[PDB]
Amino acid sequence: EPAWQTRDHLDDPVIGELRNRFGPDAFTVQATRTGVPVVWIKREQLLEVGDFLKKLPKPYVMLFDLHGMDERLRTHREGLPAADFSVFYHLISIDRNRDIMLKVALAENDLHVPTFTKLFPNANWYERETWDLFGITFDGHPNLRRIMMPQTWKGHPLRKDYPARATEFSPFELTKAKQDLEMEALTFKPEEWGMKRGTNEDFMFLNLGPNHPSAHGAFRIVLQLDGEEIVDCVPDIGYHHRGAEKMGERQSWHSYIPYTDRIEYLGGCVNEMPYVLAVEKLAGITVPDRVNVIRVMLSELFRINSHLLYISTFIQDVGAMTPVFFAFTDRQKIYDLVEAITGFRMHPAWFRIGGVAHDLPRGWDRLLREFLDWMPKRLASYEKAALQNTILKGRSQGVAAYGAKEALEWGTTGAGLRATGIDFDVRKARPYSGYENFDFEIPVGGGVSDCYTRVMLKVEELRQSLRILEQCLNNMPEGPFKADHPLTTPPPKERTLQHIETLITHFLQVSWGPVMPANESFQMIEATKGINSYYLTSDGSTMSYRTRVRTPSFAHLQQIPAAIRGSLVSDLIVYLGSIDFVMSDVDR
Amino acid sequence: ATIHVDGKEYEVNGADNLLEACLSLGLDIPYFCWHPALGSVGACRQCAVKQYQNAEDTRGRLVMSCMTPASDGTFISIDDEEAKQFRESVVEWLMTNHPHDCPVCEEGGNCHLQDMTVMTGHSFRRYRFTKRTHRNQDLGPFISHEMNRCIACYRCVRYYKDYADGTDLGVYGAHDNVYFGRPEDGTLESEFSGNLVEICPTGVFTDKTHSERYNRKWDMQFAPSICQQCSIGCNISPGERYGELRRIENRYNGTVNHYFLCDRGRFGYGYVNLKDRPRQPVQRRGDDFITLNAEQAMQGAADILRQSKKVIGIGSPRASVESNFALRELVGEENFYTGIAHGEQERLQLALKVLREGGIYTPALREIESYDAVLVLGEDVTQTGARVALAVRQAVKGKAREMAAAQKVADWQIAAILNIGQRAKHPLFVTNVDDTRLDDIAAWTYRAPVEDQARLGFAIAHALDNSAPAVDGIEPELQSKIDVIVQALAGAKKPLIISGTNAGSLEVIQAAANVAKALKGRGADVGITMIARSVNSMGLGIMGGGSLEEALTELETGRADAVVVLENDLHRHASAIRVNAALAKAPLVMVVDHQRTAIMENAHLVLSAASFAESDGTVINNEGRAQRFFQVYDPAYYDSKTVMLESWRWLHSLHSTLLSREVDWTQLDHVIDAVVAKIPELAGIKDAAPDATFRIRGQKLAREPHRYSGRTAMRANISVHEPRQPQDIDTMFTFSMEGNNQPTAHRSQVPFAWAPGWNSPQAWNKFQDEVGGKLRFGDPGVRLFETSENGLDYFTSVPARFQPQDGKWRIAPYYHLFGSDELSQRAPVFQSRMPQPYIKLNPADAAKLGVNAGTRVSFSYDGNTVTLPVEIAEGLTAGQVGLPMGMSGIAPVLAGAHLEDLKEA
Amino acid sequence: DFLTEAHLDLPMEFESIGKAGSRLGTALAMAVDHEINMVSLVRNLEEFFARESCGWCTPCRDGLPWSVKILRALERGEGQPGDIETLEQLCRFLGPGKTFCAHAPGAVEPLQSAIKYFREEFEAGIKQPFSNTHLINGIQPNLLK
Ligand code: SF4
Ligand code: SF4
Ligand code: SF4
Numbered sequence A: 001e002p003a004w005q006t007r008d009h010l011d012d013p014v015i016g017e018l019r020n021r022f023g024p025d026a027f028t029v030q031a032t033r034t035g036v037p038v039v040w041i042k043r044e045q046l047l048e049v050g051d052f053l054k055k056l057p058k059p060y061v062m063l064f065d066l067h068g069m070d071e072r073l074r075t076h077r078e079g080l081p082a083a084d085f086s087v088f089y090h091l092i093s094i095d096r097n098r099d100i101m102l103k104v105a106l107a108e109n110d111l112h113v114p115t116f117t118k119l120f121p122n123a124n125w126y127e128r129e130t131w132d133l134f135g136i137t138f139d140g141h142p143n144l145r146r147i148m149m150p151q152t153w154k155g156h157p158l159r160k161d162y163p164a165r166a167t168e169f170s171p172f173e174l175t176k177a178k179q180d181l182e183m184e185a186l187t188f189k190p191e192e193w194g195m196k197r198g199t200n201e202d203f204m205f206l207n208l209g210p211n212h213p214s215a216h217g218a219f220r221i222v223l224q225l226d227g228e229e230i231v232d233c234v235p236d237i238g239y240h241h242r243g244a245e246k247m248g249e250r251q252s253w254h255s256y257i258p259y260t261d262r263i264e265y266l267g268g269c270v271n272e273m274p275y276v277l278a279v280e281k282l283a284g285i286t287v288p289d290r291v292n293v294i295r296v297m298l299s300e301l302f303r304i305n306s307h308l309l310y311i312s313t314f315i316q317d318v319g320a321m322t323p324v325f326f327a328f329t330d331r332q333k334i335y336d337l338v339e340a341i342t343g344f345r346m347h348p349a350w351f352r353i354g355g356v357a358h359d360l361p362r363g364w365d366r367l368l369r370e371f372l373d374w375m376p377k378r379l380a381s382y383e384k385a386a387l388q389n390t391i392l393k394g395r396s397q398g399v400a401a402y403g404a405k406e407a408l409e410w411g412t413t414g415a416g417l418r419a420t421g422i423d424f425d426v427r428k429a430r431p432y433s434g435y436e437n438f439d440f441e442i443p444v445g446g447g448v449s450d451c452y453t454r455v456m457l458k459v460e461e462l463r464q465s466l467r468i469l470e471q472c473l474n475n476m477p478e479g480p481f482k483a484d485h486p487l488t489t490p491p492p493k494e495r496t497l498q499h500i501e502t503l504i505t506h507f508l509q510v511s512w513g514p515v516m517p518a519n520e521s522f523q524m525i526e527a528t529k530g531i532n533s534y535y536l537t538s539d540g541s542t543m544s545y546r547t548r549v550r551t552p553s554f555a556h557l558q559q560i561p562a563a564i565r566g567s568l569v570s571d572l573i574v575y576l577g578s579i580d581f582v583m584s585d586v587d588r
Numbered sequence B: 001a002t003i004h005v006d007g008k009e010y011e012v013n014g015a016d017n018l019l020e021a022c023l024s025l026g027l028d029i030p031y032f033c034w035h036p037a038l039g040s041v042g043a044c045r046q047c048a049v050k051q052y053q054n055a056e057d058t059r060g061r062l063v064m065s066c067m068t069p070a071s072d073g074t075f076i077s078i079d080d081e082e083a084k085q086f087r088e089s090v091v092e093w094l095m096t097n098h099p100h101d102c103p104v105c106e107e108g109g110n111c112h113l114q115d116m117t118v119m120t121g122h123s124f125r126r127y128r129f130t131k132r133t134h135r136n137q138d139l140g141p142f143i144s145h146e147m148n149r150c151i152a153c154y155r156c157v158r159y160y161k162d163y164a165d166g167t168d169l170g171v172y173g174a175h176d177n178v179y180f181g182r183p184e185d186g187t188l189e190s191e192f193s194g195n196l197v198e199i200c201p202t203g204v205f206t207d208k209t210h211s212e213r214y215n216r217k218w219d220m221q222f223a224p225s226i227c228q229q230c231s232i233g234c235n236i237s238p239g240e241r242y243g244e245l246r247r248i249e250n251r252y253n254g255t256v257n258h259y260f261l262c263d264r265g266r267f268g269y270g271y272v273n274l275k276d277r278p279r280q281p282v283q284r285r286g287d288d289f290i291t292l293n294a295e296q297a298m299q300g301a302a303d304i305l306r307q308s309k310k311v312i313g314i315g316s317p318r319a320s321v322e323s324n325f326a327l328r329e330l331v332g333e334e335n336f337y338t339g340i341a342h343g344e345q346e347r348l349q350l351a352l353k354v355l356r357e358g359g360i361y362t363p364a365l366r367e368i369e370s371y372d373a374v375l376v377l378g379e380d381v382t383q384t385g386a387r388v389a390l391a392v393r394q395a396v397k398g399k400a401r402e403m404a405a406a407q408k409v410a411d412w413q414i415a416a417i418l419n420i421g422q423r424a425k426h427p428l429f430v431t432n433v434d435d436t437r438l439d440d441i442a443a444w445t446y447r448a449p450v451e452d453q454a455r456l457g458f459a460i461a462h463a464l465d466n467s468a469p470a471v472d473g474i475e476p477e478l479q480s481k482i483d484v485i486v487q488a489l490a491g492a493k494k495p496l497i498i499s500g501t502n503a504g505s506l507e508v509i510q511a512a513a514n515v516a517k518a519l520k521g522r523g524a525d526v527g528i529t530m531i532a533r534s535v536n537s538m539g540l541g542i543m544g545g546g547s548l549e550e551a552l553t554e555l556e557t558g559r560a561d562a563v564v565v566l567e568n569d570l571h572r573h574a575s576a577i578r579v580n581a582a583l584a585k586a587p588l589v590m591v592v593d594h595q596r597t598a599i600m601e602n603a604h605l606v607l608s609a610a611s612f613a614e615s616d617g618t619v620i621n622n623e624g625r626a627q628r629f630f631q632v633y634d635p636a637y638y639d640s641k642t643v644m645l646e647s648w649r650w651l652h653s654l655h656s657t658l659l660s661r662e663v664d665w666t667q668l669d670h671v672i673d674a675v676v677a678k679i680p681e682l683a684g685i686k687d688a689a690p691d692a693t694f695r696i697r698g699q700k701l702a703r704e705p706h707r708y709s710g711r712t713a714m715r716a717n718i719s720v721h722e723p724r725q726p727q728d729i730d731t732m733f734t735f736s737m738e739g740n741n742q743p744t745a746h747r748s749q750v751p752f753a754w755a756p757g758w759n760s761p762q763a764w765n766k767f768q769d770e771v772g773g774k775l776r777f778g779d780p781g782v783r784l785f786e787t788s789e790n791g792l793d794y795f796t797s798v799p800a801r802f803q804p805q806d807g808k809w810r811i812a813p814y815y816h817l818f819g820s821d822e823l824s825q826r827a828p829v830f831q832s833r834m835p836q837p838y839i840k841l842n843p844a845d846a847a848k849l850g851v852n853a854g855t856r857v858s859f860s861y862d863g864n865t866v867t868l869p870v871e872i873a874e875g876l877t878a879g880q881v882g883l884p885m886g887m888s889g890i891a892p893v894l895a896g897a898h899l900e901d902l903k904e905a
Numbered sequence C: 001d002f003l004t005e006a007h008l009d010l011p012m013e014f015e016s017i018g019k020a021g022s023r024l025g026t027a028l029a030m031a032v033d034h035e036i037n038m039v040s041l042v043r044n045l046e047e048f049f050a051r052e053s054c055g056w057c058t059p060c061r062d063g064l065p066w067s068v069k070i071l072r073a074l075e076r077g078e079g080q081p082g083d084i085e086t087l088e089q090l091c092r093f094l095g096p097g098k099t100f101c102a103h104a105p106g107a108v109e110p111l112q113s114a115i116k117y118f119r120e121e122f123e124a125g126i127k128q129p130f131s132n133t134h135l136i137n138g139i140q141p142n143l144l145k
């Protein structure tokens, strides 16, 4: 049985535990290609089910995702409960190495769910986004305001009846919003932001803006300060909202890949990988070994690129302005290889449904060998010159520290999670794309996640990625770069150019789109900045019915107020430098 | 019946085959040679499924689902591995000889063969040998021929010969060298040849008119519309690209036209793309023609109309119900005139009275195929109401259908039905001034003048019922033919009487009403059909008004000093000299039209109205069904200087500017509400389509496919800034892809058929409740009137027989599908298909005048000595001259008129 | 279907020849001597059957010429791997019930019997490797394993 086969996961012990606790008629098991047990729960039992899952002997400790779905236009809902809308909750048990998706059905008139924030504190921003884009209210939310769109926005854009395209520009509304920006500070009240006890008459409220662009993007933080100390802060995000999920409903399965590239714009093929894996699950495609090795090599090259930018920008944020020049030279060596292979630098859009766009060009191994010879001396030089400097250490060690429990309750993944001692990397826990055939280690911290431990963990991750790249260079399999499946999009170009049935398949795949049979698929990968996941719902058409992108930077930015409370503003900017986020990842 | 497909239970009709039953259930089985309207023949072998004897059977056997009845307790599997392998092998065998042609093939993106190649999963070629090749034929100006792409599915010949009764298309050769086409190069002679471009699943037969300005299906902007070229009211999907009307596709209406159009509707759309159309309001100031915008045109027209002492309005059967009503409201009911002549108005109102007061049910176009005997009186149906002629051919094949049903043959086994029937057919009797295209299947044809055809109808009615008035002076041979018709009509379970206004005779319609009444009095399930002239002839008849002669009298006497002519060239309904003199006498002529007509030279103001592609409205077809047509595209999207509005919008704004000195562009639903409030006989046009607030789960209905391309480049040469999406306040459709076109959406107006995996016209299967039936949530369009409880009295005005007077030549109308309709004859592709102008003569009359075939003779009508070449008509009765109605220079009002000094030029 | 020397001691009845893997047919038997190449004989038979197709239904009309071309290639030693598997698949998919009439099952009976009994002669015509494509300069091919 292939890994993409539709399964109900009734053999999962969590299904038997839920049946013993709540009864057989309390929930409905849905068969998916998500790889996880999908369980439809009544709305009135959601908090009970969540508490039961949190109190299991090997408990579900992290709320991985929480979002909504407009099911009104979905025609293939066989075996599913009646629902105009739905809200899903993806929960992860690291100790079990398992996960469960809970789905709550909602009628159009009764669009309210109990809040999940008492069980999982990252449900705050997840429910705010679900309210913003779908109009689903969450009862008991401390402050349920829009998080992506401005507060004076009409409608909920992820609803199926909301038009996707840009509306006509108007200078009058730009003038009005400029006036709101001008008198935003004059009419600032802490109550609408969730802040309290401000203006005591000792705290000040200070807004941060687009004044420190360290390649992360534009966003705002309003800080409540007792003198120099942060007593509370909320981040203002949505300034980088691109409507990428709505675009997922707007593009074909093939023509959405460039948009996947720009979700986390320092990641490239890393961003492409979960989307094409989830589409290949929908299509029932198993890629050959050469495709797996090529995709792993591209992912690790882009992981090294992103880590180089992250480490150098952290060093620049601390104050040492020199290593960014050399690290971008190393990024140019990576770009030499990536340009030669894919034809592009930052957004290659090179992965395909069923494979990659072209075969490897002749001479790729020379460029890979040159980069693998160039990198280690440069990395050691950066370590000795900057990361072992005691001023940088005094600026970063012990700054914005959190443990394993705080990382689990906020959905922190990647190096921030592993610096707390939790050994959870997707490439080892849930292997994908042939990562199990590579010899590499997962660096973990001592139990405490500071700025410094996160940065050094990413340095060790860079070294491990260099090891994986060495293995990719030494053992690259001979074979096809595209699968021999009819839904491989596009087909191999030479057969398209001389064979009529292949030309027909190409013609219909690039124009109307490949038809993905109606299913739900999920793919989780270890991205550059944490765990990135694609959750795709196909309604049997050539476009996605729903494209949900879970990004780790959203969770990290939500964790910011809990970790930085009681610190200084300098600690905050160092913390932002050490998070490894981009605003495109946060806002999608 | 109960079937089990892949272990799932389904309830189906046992009289259906497994292919149409499984397609009606939403299951996907690839198929080529089967069509819902043509039956099953089992040729292509694509539709293989695995049938098991019972539930406890694992072996099974491969069967053709189209040839297998969907009987009770039938166990089949579609997703069986051997069935999937065989279906892929059938696609592969078709692919061995198929040309590498998809980029340069007009079927691409709309091709059933492409869809089934992808559906079977065949994408790898292992055949390595040569491909067979064919030369192409020239098939005329409408259909392009490319025999390389043929998969030998036999759909074309089955449709063209067995369905449409065409004679000049066939299959030649044998084995893998079978050829589909004409026996030699020439134009396809069938009036329904254009349906080949949708019947053929490949790109062999393609739309040449679309091929000139070709674009793919995903790039089209579609709207549900009604064909404007005659009164039948076939549902169409016009598709536009880059501001020009590109194609007319068939829009499935299970009540009216189902799968098929006629060639006039399919190819006569070219007048929309004419470059001489008015695009802006133009005011004639002396010898100058200045261009106005909408507001100042309204202000100037309103000022001049306010200064006038009496304003009259002249409507047209070309215009919609809303436009004619808006003109009637602008000028007043007592000042409103229908644009047709007095005799045409009398015939149209008599046909209307027979339809909605005769007590006899009038069938829809699909229902015509279920009648057991047909009498056509006077109306050359193939040239005037062509789709009715196609339906009549199906009703004629009903006898073979009944004979095969007596022998327990399934209704989809079409070859067995045709073999059992042989040449047997239901009785058909056609009367005309000459031969018709229905003479090949008619049991009898009566070639006679219109008075003699009416007398034959009156005699048939009298022999059916003695209370009907008798006819004196019937010859014994004609009496024997009358008796043959009488026993054929009396023995029929469902007789159908077809007539219309195109014969130019009131007595023909009266005789048809008498025959229908006599059949109704005997307890028969009789139906009556009236063929009108134009798309909204019945709507103009229901609205009523004075004739064009009265309007010209008002203009000539000086009682009216302002005339507003709506969508009427005025020369088809009255003599051109009288019209020109009356319009020159009037100090204000305003012409609201979308075509450059001859009366615009003397017009003081010309309002650039919208054609059907750029407008919304309602039209009433020949059976009284109100149907809404929706705007296809915004004419101002590319050319921002284009001020081309709906006629009702122009006239409503003119009325508002005349009354309150303020402009009011209004909304379509407001005008429809005004129509149904003021005219109760048109109250059913409210329910022809839902209003503009209708939504499918909150979203509008999309006009263009979801893969519509070039949004940020199609207007980039004009400006790199993308314009605002055109807003549609009038209807529930949006001028974008951001809308709903799901086959399961609860609606009746479908702009185009597309489903995932079905890009061809076969997606209409997904849009239907059952395949070949109706649309899933009802066919659009409602009937204005029900059958009345009581009928009319017998018409006692039996005319005298035709007598040839010396020196006077009675004009016999000859209609042409390509040429008689005004707008379609303006289409450039129709000029090659148009017959050359002529005059038909009896051999005795031509010998008396000393002329041969081809000699040019001259005649004077209303002081216009015009010269035409003579051709000899064998079937025309002496004392008559055959003239082609509706052509250039020959108005349709000349039918039934008389000619003087007809002599050799 | 072809039969061997071991089937010569079989009564000429419908039932006896039917269970031997053949048909009684017209009962006018044809003897094939050792000097006759089986591939050329089946090529002659399939050429007759393909050109006598009435052209109504796809498997016979478009699959018998494919078998003809494969047998012609095997005759001159131009066969490629997968040709015999293609012939066997054509025999399976042109059997009874798959085509509109019984012309094509009769057409594929001698082909399948000759492959069953004389497979060494059909394998001897496979000399060249499989090549359905030519190289296109600038496009690297997808090398399937
Ligand atoms: S008929 Fe269809 S498959 Fe053949 S060339 Fe045209 S689009 Fe391609
Ligand atoms: S020309 Fe078209 S409809 Fe006719 S047999 Fe060939 S593929 Fe079928
Ligand atoms: S029969 Fe009349 S309404 Fe129908 S397609 Fe032809 S011209 Fe148009």
Ligand code: SF4
Residues within 6 Å of the ligand: C052, C053, C054, C055, C056, C057, C058, C060, C061, C099, C100, C101, C102, C103, C104
């Ligand atoms: S199997 Fe029979 S019906 Fe089919 S093409 Fe061959 S000879 Fe004709």
Ligand code: FES
Residues within 6 Å of the ligand: B019, B030, B031, B032, B033, B034, B041, B042, B043, B044, B045, B046, B047, B064, B065, B066, B067
């Ligand atoms: S559709 Fe049944 S054999 Fe052609």
Ligand SMILES: [Ca+2]
Residues within 6 Å of the ligand: B614, B615, B616, B631, B728, B730, B731
């Ligand atoms: Ca409109």
